[PDB]
């Protein structure tokens, strides 16, 4: 909040927001002159680069990697589009019951919900992730009522 | 064939969305997945009836259908696709699907939000299926109230001032299309009148042709922005959730050149005929006015604005100078700025709120934490520069050839307005590239703390891939929007009569 | 019941506009009391206790472009204010921009003759001269105007609340006091000098000639005795409120050990940890006589009567030196180490 | 010429209803023999 | 909005596949410039059936007629300047191409595979002898 | 409600019955009425800050303009839409008003500046109230814009010109404050809303009327035929 204030007004064009090329304080210690070698190969890399998302964990997954060897191939030995706009249709349904029955996590509710006091933890996990339809808990009127232990 | 499609085509989206309400099941995660799969199914029925339920070889109607629905002033369900709307319709599924999937991370409300994106879908379509001249004004003003509450709810600072400008211009607007409405509703309503495909025949006297061609004219202008009209556009694009400003300026914005090709080129000729060439003057300076002032703005949101307004240049002389390119080349000008425009706005709406500064003076070195930003940015950047390969090339050369073989004028405008539409080349990269060097170049502070600072994850990266294939794909070879056999009787009427 | 305070000015003639708020909050009870200002004013509302939120919108140019002019009439109208009381000296040009705000009394200043002398009909309580010269007397109509104009309520309300008592949030009060204290020396036992430069550092927007800066060598003379003797002898703070990055490298009160610091209007608390403070007419004199911090105030000459009305603030503490010859920068500098040697 | 000028007028179009609606609207005000006297100058002229 | 002057191609009827609308540049009154645009549009109506002979001729019928306006228009503005003598034989050759035209168009337009392909044998041979009696 | 239903029934029979050769200095007389009603009565309805008093201008100062828009224009051919406008005004009017009573005894307030928030502590007398305004602003999917426009299309097909375009603009304009109190209803600053709303115990015959008087103010312009059919057999 003290916010200071600020200063001799600046170029309206100031040619790049940076520090005039006179103390840019390396040339080519900043862009180039600057590589060694260090390590870790290629395909350890990869497959271990895929991985920090979870993007599918089981089923879901087999549904969604084996589907675009299964439509691109549809398009030879050809089969009537009916049948290939039917496959892509229960695809996007089965592909969307299973991520909405996947649990829920603090990032995805209410900002003012989002900052409680370390006491969201049982007031979510394994709270809400217990029940179907209960709102005993239901304190999205905001006013700081919490209505929790 | 007989089994609805159009029908559904518009009935699915409202419908299938007003189940959110009444659905009580969390604060913001089901209802995305049950919004993207209500998405993704309309595209799919979409590309389904394009397939296999159309010919690209015959000009009439396809799909249409009708009922009764008022009957006092005949009024109908009357609903049928077209080679003009076809484009349109598929690049409105198609961005809306992934402005909606862009809208991902919203929180704050995220039950109003999706149904309120549902809406608007339907009533795009619903505006660009119409066959019935009230039904296609209904569809038109059905979005007014939606887009502002997605306003007024997120996006920007001073959301409000923009918000309520936007509406009461955008309604004030309409008006004049309203008068139009009643004038050749009641011209002979014996005569079906309100069918927008037996209208066709319609030999009105003069000094009534030219009030409602004005009246329709002046609605349009208000919609697709023309110079003397253009003052809402950057309070409403600079204020508005990138999400909302994707589908915003790349379809809504083309609602006001399809109309103004369906319902004035197609119904009143000798009203237009002696009217193209101040729209083609109108539009050729605007294409310089329009630069000229983005050049001037600050904050890069209102400087992308203008950009969008510039590129509404070419589609205006593409309507007049009546040739079947020229009418031709400006769908797909509206296709190739309905990608390049939304795009645009999804990056800068995804660099801001990562740096929260508005004003393109104190933007530092963000190329050193976020690579992939500034690469898919500098490539929709060249888009926009008209660049060959890239789509946004082919439209202004084919609107190009359409003025220069244009049969409505001789020699002494035909280069003249050439010369001021060319110069637009020279003055856009000065503005556009003004600002790739100030807000990414150079080396700013040692930005070294990966907070606040994280490059594009899997689910932006993906949208701007997604969007940026069809930009390529569409520029090395622009037959896949070419599928239009309309033209070929769209510009058939006017072609002889007098002057 | 909603109040909106439209204050003009920056800083020096708008710290004086605390006591017309606490009026304003303690005649209506627990009223929602706004204010809109200038960039460099609105600084200063984050040390109070009363206003619900500022805002910035007038330095009151001549031209602004007719959308910044709709969006505030925009912002101000859509939440109905009751009475905007008013300053600025509004004409018949500014007038009509309080009217648009569709409020119920709407009070404010008026020019005598000149600009104008206009005042519309469309106002209320209009009155003396435009450019508010004095200190503590300030909007001296404004605190007759609320005063048992209207009913029952006790005769006069306190006449002229307690003058400035700025509180300090004790979060700023802490952790950037210390962090800018101990860059340099510190012990909570030096002594504040203020008007050095001219740039932004109050210019009080009424002092007009003098107060602006001292050549910065009476300057050096008054702080070599100054750390002289075991009272202080932590206090070399020039205290520069400038780009000083442009006058540091010239302070002749040799740089040895005379230490600096940047500050916006949030210096407040930098005064309540120090041992005292020497000034000229700014608004350290007034923020120091609002707490106890007593203070040593150096004008030019007899203003005391317009800028400072308290002349005994606590015990006659806070002290102030005239200048025989009038301008400021000749003062028997001498007396005035005399004086402060005390402290 | 943009901002001052054609924004000056699409605001100026909805900024001098703010000022006509209060204008008009402290005209009156109260005072029952102003209603009756404001009711009689409309009946006598359009007399005519 | 443009006219003919030698009205014997015209045919009973007087019309013919011509997509009006297409502009020809001006290159001047001569038996030099419109004996070599004919030429150099009679040789692409060669190329046509390469690629585009087969596999959905739905664009043969959108490109035939507009290569050949250029061929109606030309060949007239020529027929006119050319001596008394060489105009009879000339006219003669225009009347067997300008048929064969609208004979290929409207056997196109049945979306056939071999009547096509029958039909463009014979405006290949007359087509294949424009490009010399030029 | 009654009065002006009252009033317009006996305006009409007084002034066709008796007065068949005026027609040309009534005509005229009452249309300056309502250029000027459709007009006063928008203007001062910005500028208001009550409830009541806001209604007042708008609902009736400006409203009673367009049922008087084609008793001037009148050939028999209109006297079905001025039947079909009051039916559909009774409701879109009754609607608010029973909103408005219902949220007044909740809290105790008539200002405008206390309906922050009130989206969030009750959700349905929200939309129940921004149903009927969005209405009572003539916007397509509703019934007021069937009836402006079916008002007009009847009037417009009768000659007269400055009367249905001074009726379209003063609607935009009065789109204004409708938008403005909507607006007002959809926020979450708490430290905003004032403590009217903060104490709200949310929740028979005020509720009945309420949500059986707001479909009737969406339902009808969508389904105008029989109304309409009916309302062509008036000859008086």
Request: one cysteine or more.
């Given at each position: 909040?003290?916010?200071?204030?600020?200063?001799?007004?600046?170029?309206?064009?100031?040619?790049?927001?940076?520090?005039?090329?006179?103390?840019?304080?390396?040339?080519?210690?900043?862009?180039?002159?600057?590589?060694?070698?260090?390590?870790?190969?290629?395909?350890?890399?990869?497959?271990?680069?895929?991985?920090?998302?979870?993007?599918?964990?089981?089923?879901?997954?087999?549904?969604?990697?084996?589907?675009?060897?299964?439509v691109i191939?549809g398009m030879a030995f050809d089969v009537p589009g009916e049948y290939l706009y039917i496959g892509a249709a229960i695809f996007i349904?089965?592909?969307?019951?299973?991520?909405?029955?996947?649990?829920?996590?603090?990032?995805?509710?209410?900002?003012?919900?989002?900052?409680?006091?370390?006491?969201?933890?049982?007031?979510?996990?394994?709270?809400?992730?217990?029940?179907?339809?209960?709102?005993?808990?239901?304190?999205?009127?905001?006013?700081?009522?919490?209505?929790?232990? | 064939s007989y089994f609805p499609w159009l029908t559904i085509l518009v009935?699915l989206?409202?419908?299938?969305?007003?189940?959110?309400?009444?659905?009580?099941?969390?604060?913001?995660?089901?209802?995305?997945?049950?919004?993207?799969?209500?998405?993704l199914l309309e595209f799919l029925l979409m590309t389904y009836a394009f397939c296999y339920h159309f010919q690209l070889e015959d000009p009439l109607i396809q799909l249409k259908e009708?009922?009764?629905?008022?009957?006092?002033?005949?009024?109908?369900?009357?609903l049928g696709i077209d080679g003009?709307s076809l484009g349109?319709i598929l690049?409105?599924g198609f961005?809306?699907?992934?402005?909606?999937?862009?809208?991902?991370?919203?929180?704050?409300?995220?039950?109003?939000?999706?149904?309120?994106?549902?809406?608007?879908?339907?009533?795009?379509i619903?505006?660009?299926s119409?066959?019935?001249?009230?039904?296609?004004?209904?569809?038109?003003?059905?979005?007014?109230?939606?887009?502002?509450?997605?306003?007024?709810?997120?996006?920007?600072?001073?959301?409000?001032?923009?918000?309520?400008?936007?509406?009461?211009?955008?309604?004030?607007?309409?008006?004049?299309?309203?008068?139009?409405?009643?004038?050749?509703?009641?011209?002979?309503?014996?005569?079906?009148?309100?069918?927008?495909?037996?209208?066709?025949?319609?030999?009105?006297?003069?000094?009534?042709?030219?009030?409602?061609?004005?009246?329709?004219?002046?609605?349009?202008?208000?919609?697709?922005?023309?110079?003397?009209?253009?003052?809402?556009?950057?309070?409403?694009?600079?204020?508005?959730?990138?999400?909302?400003?994707?589908?915003?300026?790349?379809?809504?914005?083309?609602?006001?050149?399809?109309?103004?090709?369906?319902?004035?080129?197609?119904?009143?000729?000798?009203?237009?005929?002696?009217?193209?060439?101040?729209?083609?003057?109108?539009?050729?300076?605007?294409?310089?006015?329009?630069?000229?002032?983005?050049?001037?703005?600050?904050?890069?949101?209102?400087?992308?604005?203008?950009?969008?307004?510039?590129?509404?240049?070419?589609?205006?002389?593409?309507?007049?100078?009546?040739?079947?390119?020229?009418?031709?080349?400006?769908?797909?000008?509206?296709?190739?700025?309905?990608?390049?425009?939304?795009?645009?706005?999804?990056?800068?709406?995804?660099?801001?709120?990562?740096?929260?500064?508005?004003?393109?003076?104190?933007?530092?070195?963000?190329?050193?934490?976020?690579?992939?930003?500034?690469?898919?940015?500098?490539?929709?950047?060249?888009?926009?520069?008209?660049?060959?390969?890239?789509?946004?090339?082919?439209?202004?050369?084919?609107?190009?050839?359409?003025?220069?073989?244009?049969?409505?004028?001789?020699?002494?405008?035909?280069?003249?307005?050439?010369?001021?539409?060319?110069?637009?080349?020279?003055?856009?990269?000065?503005?556009?590239?003004?600002?790739?060097?100030?807000?990414?170049?150079?080396?700013?502070?040692?930005?070294?703390?990966?907070?606040?600072?994280?490059?594009?994850?899997?689910?932006?990266?993906?949208?701007?891939?997604?969007?940026?294939?069809?930009?390529?794909?569409?520029?090395?070879?622009?037959?896949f929007v070419?599928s239009l056999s309309?033209?070929?009787?769209?510009?058939?009427?006017?072609?002889?009569?007098?002057? | 019941?909603?109040?909106?305070?439209?204050?003009?000015?920056?800083?020096?003639?708008?710290?004086?506009?605390?006591?017309?708020?606490?009026?304003?909050?303690?005649?209506?009870?627990?009223?929602?009391?706004?204010?809109?200002?200038?960039?460099?004013?609105?600084?200063?509302?984050?040390?109070?206790?009363?206003?619900?939120?500022?805002?910035?919108?007038?330095?009151?140019?001549?031209?602004?472009?007719?959308?910044?002019?709709?969006?505030?009439?925009?912002?101000?109208?859509?939440?109905?204010?009751?009475?905007?009381?008013?300053?600025?000296?509004?004409?018949?040009?500014?007038?009509?921009?309080?009217?648009?705000?569709?409020?119920?009394?709407?009070?404010?200043?008026?020019?005598?003759?000149?600009?104008?002398?206009?005042?519309?009909?469309?106002?209320?309580?209009?009155?003396?001269?435009?450019?508010?010269?004095?200190?503590?007397?300030?909007?001296?109509?404004?605190?007759?105007?609320?005063?048992?104009?209207?009913?029952?309520?006790?005769?006069?309300?306190?006449?002229?609340?307690?003058?400035?008592?700025?509180?300090?949030?004790?979060?700023?009060?802490?952790?950037?006091?210390?962090?800018?204290?101990?860059?340099?020396?510190?012990?909570?036992?030096?002594?504040?000098?203020?008007?050095?430069?001219?740039?932004?550092?109050?210019?009080?927007?009424?002092?007009?000639?003098?107060?602006?800066?001292?050549?910065?060598?009476?300057?050096?003379?008054?702080?070599?005795?100054?750390?002289?003797?075991?009272?202080?002898?932590?206090?070399?703070?020039?205290?520069?409120?400038?780009?000083?990055?442009?006058?540091?490298?010239?302070?002749?009160?040799?740089?040895?050990?005379?230490?600096?610091?940047?500050?916006?209007?949030?210096?407040?608390?930098?005064?309540?940890?120090?041992?005292?403070?020497?000034?000229?007419?700014?608004?350290?004199?007034?923020?120091?006589?609002?707490?106890?911090?007593?203070?040593?105030?150096?004008?030019?000459?007899?203003?005391?009567?317009?800028?400072?009305?308290?002349?005994?603030?606590?015990?006659?503490?806070?002290?102030?030196?005239?200048?025989?010859?009038?301008?400021?920068?000749?003062?028997?500098?001498?007396?005035?180490?005399?004086?402060?040697?005390?402290? | 010429?943009?901002?001052?000028?054609?924004?000056?007028?699409?605001?100026?179009?909805?900024?001098?209803?703010?000022?006509?609606?209060?204008?008009?609207?402290?005209?009156?005000?109260?005072?029952?023999?102003?209603?009756?006297?404001?009711?009689?100058?409309?009946?006598?002229?359009?007399?005519? | 909005?443009?006219?003919?002057?030698?009205?014997?191609?015209?045919?009973?009827?007087?019309?013919?596949?011509?997509?009006?609308?297409?502009?020809?540049?001006?290159?001047?009154?001569?038996?030099?410039?419109?004996?070599?645009?004919?030429?150099?549009?009679?040789?692409?109506?060669?190329?046509?059936?390469?690629?585009?002979?087969?596999e959905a001729?739905n664009?043969?019928?959108?490109?035939?007629?507009?290569?050949?306006?250029?061929?109606?228009?030309?060949?007239?503005?020529?027929?006119?300047?050319?001596?008394?003598?060489?105009?009879?034989?000339?006219?003669?050759?225009?009347?067997?191409?300008?048929?064969?035209?609208?004979?290929?168009?409207?056997?196109?337009?049945?979306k056939?595979?071999?009547?096509?392909?029958?039909?463009?044998?014979?405006?290949?041979?007359?087509?294949?002898?424009?490009?010399?009696?030029? | 409600?009654?009065?002006?239903?009252?009033?317009?029934?006996?305006?009409?029979?007084?002034?066709?019955?008796?007065?068949?050769?005026?027609?040309?200095?009534?005509?005229?007389?009452?249309?300056?009425?309502?250029?000027?009603?459709?007009?006063?009565?928008?203007?001062?309805?910005?500028?208001?800050?009550?409830?009541?008093?806001?209604?007042?201008?708008?609902?009736?100062?400006?409203?009673?303009?367009?049922?008087?828009?084609?008793?001037?224009?009148?050939?028999?051919?209109?006297?079905?839409?001025?039947?079909?406008?009051?039916?559909?005004?009774?409701?879109?009017?009754?609607?608010?008003?029973?909103?408005?009573?219902?949220?007044?005894?909740?809290?105790?307030?008539?200002?405008?500046?206390?309906?922050?928030?009130?989206?969030?502590?009750?959700?349905?007398?929200?939309?129940?109230?921004?149903?009927?305004?969005?209405?009572?602003?003539?916007?397509?999917?509703?019934?007021?814009?069937?009836?402006?426009?079916?008002?007009?299309?009847?009037?417009?097909?009768?000659?007269?010109?400055?009367?249905?375009?001074?009726?379209?603009?003063?609607?935009?304009?009065?789109?204004?404050?409708?938008?403005?109190?909507?607006?007002?209803?959809?926020?979450?600053?708490?430290?905003?809303?004032?403590?009217?709303?903060?104490?709200?115990?949310?929740?028979?015959?005020?509720?009945?009327?309420?949500?059986?008087?707001?479909?009737?103010?969406?339902?009808?312009?969508?389904?105008?035929?029989?109304?309409?059919?009916?309302?062509?057999?008036?000859?008086?």
């Open positions: 909040e003290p916010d200071l204030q600020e200063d001799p007004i600046d170029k309206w064009r100031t040619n790049g927001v940076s520090p005039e090329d006179f103390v840019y304080g390396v040339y080519d210690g900043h862009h180039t002159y600057d590589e060694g070698q260090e390590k870790k190969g290629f395909w350890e890399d990869v497959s271990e680069w895929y991985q920090e998302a979870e993007p599918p964990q089981g089923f879901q997954a087999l549904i969604s990697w084996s589907f675009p060897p299964a191939l349904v089965v592909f969307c019951i299973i991520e909405m029955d996947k649990p829920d996590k603090p990032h995805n509710f209410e900002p003012e919900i989002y900052m409680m006091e370390r006491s969201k933890r049982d007031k979510l996990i394994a709270d809400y992730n217990s029940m179907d339809i209960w709102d005993f808990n239901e304190k999205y009127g905001e006013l700081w009522d919490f209505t929790v232990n | 009935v989206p409202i419908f299938a969305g007003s189940l959110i309400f009444f659905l009580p099941h969390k604060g913001n995660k089901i209802v995305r997945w049950y919004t993207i799969s209500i998405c009708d009922y009764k629905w008022i009957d006092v002033f005949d009024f109908h369900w009357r003009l349109s690049l409105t961005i809306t699907t992934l402005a909606t999937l862009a809208a991902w991370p919203i929180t704050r409300n995220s039950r109003l939000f999706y149904f309120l994106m549902l809406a608007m879908y339907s009533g795009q619903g505006l660009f119409s066959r019935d001249l009230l039904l296609f004004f209904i569809m038109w003003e059905l979005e007014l109230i939606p887009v502002y509450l997605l306003l007024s709810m997120w996006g920007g600072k001073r959301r409000l001032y923009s918000a309520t400008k936007f509406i009461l211009y955008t309604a004030g607007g309409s008006i004049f299309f309203l008068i139009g409405v009643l004038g050749m509703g009641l011209y002979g309503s014996n005569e079906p009148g309100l069918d927008l495909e037996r209208l066709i025949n319609q030999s009105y006297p003069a000094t009534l042709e030219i009030l409602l061609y004005f009246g329709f004219l002046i609605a349009y202008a208000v919609k697709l922005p023309i110079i003397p009209l253009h003052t809402w556009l950057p309070d409403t694009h600079g204020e508005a959730h990138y999400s909302t400003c994707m589908l915003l300026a790349g379809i809504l914005l083309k609602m006001g050149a399809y109309g103004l090709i369906r319902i004035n080129m197609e119904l009143l000729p000798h009203a237009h005929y002696l009217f193209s060439p101040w729209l083609v003057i109108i539009g050729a300076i605007q294409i310089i006015y329009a630069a000229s002032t983005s050049l001037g703005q600050r904050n890069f949101k209102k400087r992308i604005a203008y950009s969008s307004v510039s590129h509404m240049g070419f589609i205006i002389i593409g309507i007049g100078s009546i040739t079947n390119i020229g009418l031709n080349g400006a769908i797909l000008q509206i296709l190739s700025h309905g990608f390049i425009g939304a795009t645009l706005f999804f990056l800068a709406g995804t660099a801001s709120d990562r740096m929260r500064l508005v004003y393109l003076e104190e933007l530092g070195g963000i190329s050193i934490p976020m690579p992939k930003i500034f690469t898919m940015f500098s490539s929709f950047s060249m888009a926009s520069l008209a660049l060959p390969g890239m789509s946004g090339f082919v439209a202004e050369l084919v609107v190009f050839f359409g003025l220069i073989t244009s049969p409505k004028f001789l020699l002494m405008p035909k280069a003249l307005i050439t010369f001021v539409m060319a110069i637009g080349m020279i003055l856009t990269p000065i503005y556009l590239l003004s600002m790739l060097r100030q807000m990414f170049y150079g080396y700013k502070l040692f930005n070294v703390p990966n907070a606040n600072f994280v490059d594009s994850g899997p689910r932006e990266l993906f949208i701007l891939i997604c969007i940026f294939l069809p930009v390529i794909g569409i520029g090395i070879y622009p037959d070419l309309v033209d070929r009787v769209e510009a058939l009427l006017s072609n002889y009569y007098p002057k | 019941r909603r109040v909106c305070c439209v204050v003009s000015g920056g800083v020096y003639e708008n710290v004086l506009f605390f006591p017309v708020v606490q009026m304003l909050k303690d005649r209506y009870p627990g009223v929602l009391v706004d204010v809109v200002a200038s960039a460099r004013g609105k600084q200063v509302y984050e040390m109070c206790k009363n206003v619900r939120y500022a805002n910035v919108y007038d330095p009151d140019d001549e031209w602004p472009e007719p959308a910044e002019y709709t969006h505030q009439l925009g912002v101000m109208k859509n939440r109905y204010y009751d009475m905007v009381l008013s300053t600025k000296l509004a004409g018949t040009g500014h007038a009509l921009f309080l009217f648009m705000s569709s409020a119920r009394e709407k009070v404010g200043y008026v020019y005598p003759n000149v600009n104008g002398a206009g005042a519309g009909l469309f106002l209320t309580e209009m009155f003396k001269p435009a450019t508010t010269n004095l200190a503590d007397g300030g909007y001296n109509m404004y605190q007759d105007m609320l005063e048992w104009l209207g009913r029952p309520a006790k005769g006069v309300p306190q006449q002229p609340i307690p003058p400035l008592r700025v509180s300090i949030s004790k979060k700023l009060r802490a952790v950037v006091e210390d962090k800018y204290n101990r860059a340099g020396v510190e012990k909570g036992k030096y002594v504040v000098i203020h008007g050095i430069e001219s740039d932004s550092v109050a210019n009080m927007k009424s002092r007009g000639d003098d107060d602006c800066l001292l050549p910065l060598e009476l300057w050096a003379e008054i702080a070599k005795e100054i750390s002289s003797g075991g009272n202080g002898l932590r206090p070399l703070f020039v205290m520069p409120h400038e780009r000083h990055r442009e006058e540091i490298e010239e302070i002749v009160g040799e740089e040895t050990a005379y230490l600096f610091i940047t500050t916006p209007g949030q210096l407040t608390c930098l005064i309540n940890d120090s041992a005292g403070v020497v000034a000229t007419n700014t608004a350290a004199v007034q923020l120091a006589n609002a707490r106890d911090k007593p203070c040593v105030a150096l004008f030019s000459s007899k203003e005391k009567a317009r800028l400072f009305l308290p002349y005994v603030e606590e015990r006659k503490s806070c002290t102030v030196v005239a200048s025989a010859t009038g301008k400021l920068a000749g003062i028997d500098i001498e007396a005035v180490k005399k004086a402060v040697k005390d402290l | 010429f943009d901002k001052g000028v054609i924004d000056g007028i699409t605001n100026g179009v909805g900024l001098a209803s703010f000022c006509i609606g209060e204008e008009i609207k402290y005209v009156g005000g109260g005072r029952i023999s102003s209603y009756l006297f404001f009711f009689l100058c409309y009946v006598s002229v359009f007399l005519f | 909005k443009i006219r003919n002057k030698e009205i014997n191609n015209g045919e009973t009827g007087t019309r013919s596949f011509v997509k009006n609308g297409i502009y020809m540049a001006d290159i001047g009154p001569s038996f030099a410039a419109h004996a070599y645009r004919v030429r150099s549009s009679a040789f692409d109506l060669l190329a046509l059936e390469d690629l585009l002979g087969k001729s664009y043969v019928n959108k490109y035939l007629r507009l290569k050949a306006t250029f061929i109606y228009y030309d060949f007239d503005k020529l027929i006119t300047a050319a001596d008394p003598d060489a105009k009879p034989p000339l006219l003669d050759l225009a009347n067997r191409l300008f048929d064969s035209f609208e004979k290929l168009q409207a056997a196109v337009t049945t056939d595979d071999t009547d096509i392909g029958s039909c463009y044998a014979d405006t290949k041979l007359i087509l294949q002898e424009v490009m010399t009696r030029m | 409600v009654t009065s002006k239903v009252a009033a317009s029934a006996s305006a009409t029979r007084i002034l066709d019955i008796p007065f068949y050769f005026s027609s040309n200095e009534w005509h005229l007389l009452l249309e300056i009425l309502a250029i000027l009603s459709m007009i006063l009565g928008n203007l001062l309805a910005i500028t208001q800050t009550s409830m009541k008093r806001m209604l007042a201008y708008s609902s009736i100062g400006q409203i009673g303009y367009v049922i008087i828009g084609i008793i001037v224009g009148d050939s028999n051919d209109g006297y079905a839409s001025m039947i079909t406008y009051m039916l559909f005004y009774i409701s879109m009017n009754l609607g608010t008003f029973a909103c408005i009573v219902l949220f007044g005894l909740r809290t105790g307030t008539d200002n405008i500046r206390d309906y922050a928030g009130l989206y969030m502590k009750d959700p349905f007398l929200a939309l129940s109230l921004a149903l009927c305004l969005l209405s009572l602003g003539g916007l397509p999917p509703l019934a007021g814009f069937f009836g402006k426009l079916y008002l007009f299309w009847c009037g417009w097909q009768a000659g007269l010109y400055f009367l249905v375009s001074i009726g379209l603009l003063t609607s935009v304009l009065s789109i204004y404050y409708y938008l403005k109190i909507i607006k007002l209803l959809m926020t979450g600053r708490n430290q905003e809303i004032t403590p009217y709303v903060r104490n709200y115990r949310r929740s028979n015959s005020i509720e009945l009327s309420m949500t059986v008087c707001v479909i009737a103010s969406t339902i009808p312009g969508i389904s105008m035929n029989p109304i309409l059919a009916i309302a062509q057999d008036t000859l008086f």
